Amino acid sequence: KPGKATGKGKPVNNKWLNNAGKDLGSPVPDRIANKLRDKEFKSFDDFRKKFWEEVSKDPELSKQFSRNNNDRMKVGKAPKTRTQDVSGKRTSFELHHEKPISGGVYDMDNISVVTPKRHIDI
């Protein structure tokens, strides 16, 4: 269901997703949270799309991805992960909620980016 994005995220280095396959993965960049905060989305999917598009517009983050991955994010799709981090048909970075419905669907502080391999272990 719809809702509004909230949270502050965290500052990230020039290797943002380097730890996406460990622990809870990589956090929502604070610069990205600033652009998405207080905005309404029809669903989490809508959020996910807007999220990646925002990443493509941030010079500090886009430079961390190849030209092909930047094009993917520019249209709202998650970037492809490295071959070693895929799992079956799941070949792109996924968003994981730390605290499930048991919540905070649009709580950027309860959202992170993880690889398929790591997500399955979680």
């Binding site: 190849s66 030209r67 092909n68 991955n69 094009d71 993917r72 520019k74 249209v75 799709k77 970037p79 492809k80 490295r82 071959t83 048909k89 070949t91 792109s92």
Partner: protein, 84 residues
Amino acid sequence: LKNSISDYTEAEFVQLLKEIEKENVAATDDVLDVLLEHFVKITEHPDGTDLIYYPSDNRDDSPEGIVKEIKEWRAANGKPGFKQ
């Protein structure tokens, strides 16, 4: 979609890469993922799609750079190259 790298001239492989680039920006990955599976199968490179999405900083991130890396790897491993 040929089933062998030897059936592709360097120019034709570039066309394949631009088709993949077009699907990259399509609404979904339904078609894209099929083209990528084909790319991985014929190239036979252990890193597969990494050649496209995670290019080495020691070469150009371009269709031309991708072809050159594939040419060098297949040659170094005694595998047939692009159709001359």
